[PDB]
Amino acid sequence: SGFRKMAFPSGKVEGCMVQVTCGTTTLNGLWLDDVVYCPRHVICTSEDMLNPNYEDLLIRKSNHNFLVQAGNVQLRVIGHSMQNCVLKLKVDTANPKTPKYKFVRIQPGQTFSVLACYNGSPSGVYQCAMRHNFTIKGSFLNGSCGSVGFNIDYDCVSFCYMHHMELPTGVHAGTDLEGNFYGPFVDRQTAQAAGTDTTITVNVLAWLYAAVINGDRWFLNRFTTTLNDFNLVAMKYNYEPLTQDHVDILGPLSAQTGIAVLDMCASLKELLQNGMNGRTILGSALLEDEFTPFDVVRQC
Amino acid sequence: SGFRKMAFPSGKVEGCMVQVTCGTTTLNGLWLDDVVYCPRHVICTSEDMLNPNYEDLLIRKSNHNFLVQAGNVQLRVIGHSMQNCVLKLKVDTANPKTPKYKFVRIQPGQTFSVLACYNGSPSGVYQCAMRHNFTIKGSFLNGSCGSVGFNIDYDCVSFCYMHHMELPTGVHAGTDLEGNFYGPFVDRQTAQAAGTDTTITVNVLAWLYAAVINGDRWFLNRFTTTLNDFNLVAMKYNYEPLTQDHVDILGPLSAQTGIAVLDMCASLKELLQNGMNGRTILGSALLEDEFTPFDVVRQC
Numbered sequence: 001s002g003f004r005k006m007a008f009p010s011g012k013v014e015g016c017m018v019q020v021t022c023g024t025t026t027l028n029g030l031w032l033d034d035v036v037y038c039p040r041h042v043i044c045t046s047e048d049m050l051n052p053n054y055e056d057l058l059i060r061k062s063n064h065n066f067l068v069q070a071g072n073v074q075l076r077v078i079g080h081s082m083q084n085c086v087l088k089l090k091v092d093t094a095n096p097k098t099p100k101y102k103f104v105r106i107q108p109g110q111t112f113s114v115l116a117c118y119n120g121s122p123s124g125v126y127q128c129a130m131r132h133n134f135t136i137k138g139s140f141l142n143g144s145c146g147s148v149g150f151n152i153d154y155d156c157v158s159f160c161y162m163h164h165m166e167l168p169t170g171v172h173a174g175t176d177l178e179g180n181f182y183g184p185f186v187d188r189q190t191a192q193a194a195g196t197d198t199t200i201t202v203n204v205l206a207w208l209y210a211a212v213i214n215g216d217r218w219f220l221n222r223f224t225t226t227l228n229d230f231n232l233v234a235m236k237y238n239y240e241p242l243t244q245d246h247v248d249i250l251g252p253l254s255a256q257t258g259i260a261v262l263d264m265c266a267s268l269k270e271l272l273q274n275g276m277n278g279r280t281i282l283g284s285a286l287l288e289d290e291f292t293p294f295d296v297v298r299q300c
Numbered sequence: 301s302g303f304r305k306m307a308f309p310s311g312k313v314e315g316c317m318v319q320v321t322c323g324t325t326t327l328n329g330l331w332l333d334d335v336v337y338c339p340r341h342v343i344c345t346s347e348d349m350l351n352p353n354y355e356d357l358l359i360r361k362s363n364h365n366f367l368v369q370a371g372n373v374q375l376r377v378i379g380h381s382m383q384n385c386v387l388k389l390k391v392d393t394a395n396p397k398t399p400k401y402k403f404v405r406i407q408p409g410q411t412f413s414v415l416a417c418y419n420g421s422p423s424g425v426y427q428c429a430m431r432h433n434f435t436i437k438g439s440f441l442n443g444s445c446g447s448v449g450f451n452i453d454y455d456c457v458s459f460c461y462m463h464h465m466e467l468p469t470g471v472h473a474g475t476d477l478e479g480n481f482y483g484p485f486v487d488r489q490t491a492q493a494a495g496t497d498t499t500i501t502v503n504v505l506a507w508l509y510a511a512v513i514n515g516d517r518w519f520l521n522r523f524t525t526t527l528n529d530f531n532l533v534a535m536k537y538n539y540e541p542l543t544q545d546h547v548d549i550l551g552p553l554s555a556q557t558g559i560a561v562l563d564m565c566a567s568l569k570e571l572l573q574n575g576m577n578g579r580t581i582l583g584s585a586l587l588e589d590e591f592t593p594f595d596v597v598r599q600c
């Protein structure tokens with residue numbers, strides 16, 4: 001019993017974190033086989049934060065300009081190249097702790113675990129969702145760039161996020177491990193702001209099903225609605241429209257609890273219109289949207 | 301920026317988890333040097349859940365009755381003994397991944413990270429607080445017994461919790477690693493229930509300070525109260541009384557934000573009497589009490 005925000009065990013990723021220093025700039029890098037991946041703005045200079053041209057900056061760099069440390073063991077850089085917004089540093093030693101891994105790009109609504117790192121050293125782990133405006137609401141201080149986000153499948157680490165920057169509203173933006181930013185953001189100091197965000201409806205419903213599995217039942221009712229009439233009220237409260245594929249994904253949860261997905265939609269409709277009236281659901285007083293249906297099935 | 305529920309990197313503990321099997325009962329054990337620690341009810345039989353005498357059960361056991369697996373590597377048990385409610389199994393191999401560690405017992409209000417394990421295999425990590433009634437609100441399914449809770453200090457793992465059982469209300473009870481239960485619970489199936497719980501006041505205040513550090517300021521006000529008059533309203537809402545030592549611990553946070561602790565108490569008083577009126581604090585619609593002052597300082 002119980003339902004908690006839960007992250008993946010981080011040991012397989014801890015073994016890959018290193019420190020990358022260029023000049024007087026230090027951030028974290030990810031060491032897999034004989035390549036270190038890190039954000040390219042580690043080569044940025046003070047008088048270049050305006051309109052930096054990273055191709056120019058990198059052509060003016062040599063291998064000895066990059067200092068890489070794995071613990072108290074300096075790694076010798078023997079090649080460098082740029083892969084969109086990430087830098088690839090070829091080193092003379094393959095990481096013996098390299099796990100089976102994949103580079104994957106996630107979608108809005110999907111979750112992953114973040115290993116927050118400072119100076120190549122892991123300090124904490126937490127769970128995050130990619131929002132609809134391609135930001136994440138993380139916890140990141142100065143020096144955290146290069147921290148990575150990941151999912152684990154059996155023994156395989158699917159790397160999906162590298163941290164690059166913080167936006168004015170305090171949310172966070174980054175890239176996949178191929179260097180392609182999530183969302184319309186660039187790695188230079190401009191007036192870029194996040195677009196408007198929406199509530200992830202399929203995740204809220206999954207979370208309601210986790211509530212029922214854990215004995216919270218006060219929000220249920222005898223009403224049932226159509227998918228169409230549910231989406232009408234969803235738009236009014238800035239929720240994502242529900243699709244048939246979203247109903248299918250909720251199938252297993254619906255079967256386990258004996259509660260039809262559209263029955264649970266009818267409950268969510270009433271929660272939006274009347275609120276909670278003081279009561280809580282799984283220890284929360286608002287509707288949580290950062291648990292996928294997979295996260296719920298795994299934990300319950 | 302940002303404030304998230306955050307756990308410690310779990311790699312140092314992942315390397316210590318093993319599977320302990322006795323008969324047809326399988327739970328998780330903790331392998332440090334040449335000793336495996338696990339809950340003693342792994343020796344329980346079906347016709348003994350009433351009034352089991354564990355001394356009797358263990359005298360009737362031999363070393364070959366305990367099957368210990370570290371991955372796909374069977375560990376040879378060469379000695380056993382009971383340490384209150386935990387079993388100590390001496391094995392013929394010292395764990396080469398054994399970190400620097402301590403056995404410590406925590407207090408109500410203090411937090412720790414839980415590595416949830418099934419069959420000797422870590423599946424997720426989350427943060428927990430010891431409540432005032434010595435339960436934790438964890439996330440634990442059948443087979444999770446022997447999962448451990450821990451804090452990390454630099455390079456040292458302070459083990460503070462081993463999971464033993466789930467109570468009827470769905471909260472969880474366990475022991476320190478010396479086998480002494482937290483709270484008035486025993487490891488046999490009776491009608492034991494958790495006592496009444498209280499809100500951890502010093503943690504709520506720490507969390508309000510984290511809000512201010514993260515730009516949430518709408519709950520502040522120009523009022524200031526005495527410690528005595530604050531405790532009067534705290535008792536009325538089932539909050540723990542605040543002490544001077546609790547004010548001292550909040551010193552650093554008070555200095556960083558320029559907000560006097562008793563000023564923040566005056567804000568908390570108004571939140572209890574009027575509520576939040578729809579607004580949220582750090583993405584929550586209730587007052588969170590599972591962040592210690594240390595947890596806040598570490599993350600902000």
Ligand SMILES: Cc1ccc(NC(=O)c2ccc(CN3CCN(C)CC3)cc2)cc1Nc1nc(-c2cccnc2)cs1
Nearest residue numbers: 023024025041044045046140141142164165166187188301
């Ligand atoms: C997107 C981006 C673009 C360029 C930079 N780099 C700089 O601003 C910068 C880099 C290096 C220097 C120092 N110079 C270069 C070294 N040395 C020669 C001296 C001068 C001065 C400024 C950082 C970022 N990303 C950042 N993310 C954060 C951040 C803060 C808190 C939480 N999460 C992310 C701060 S900056």
Ligand SMILES: Cc1ccc(NC(=O)c2ccc(CN3CCN(C)CC3)cc2)cc1Nc1nc(-c2cccnc2)cs1
Nearest residue numbers: 001323324325341344345346440441442464465466487488
């Ligand atoms: C406190 C306690 C006391 C005794 C036991 N053990 C049993 O009930 C039990 C143990 C073994 C058997 C099987 N027998 C022994 C082996 N074999 C000979 C066949 C018969 C049958 C029952 C478990 C516990 N603890 C438990 N915690 C949970 C639990 C569930 C979900 C989440 N967190 C904890 C279930 S049981």
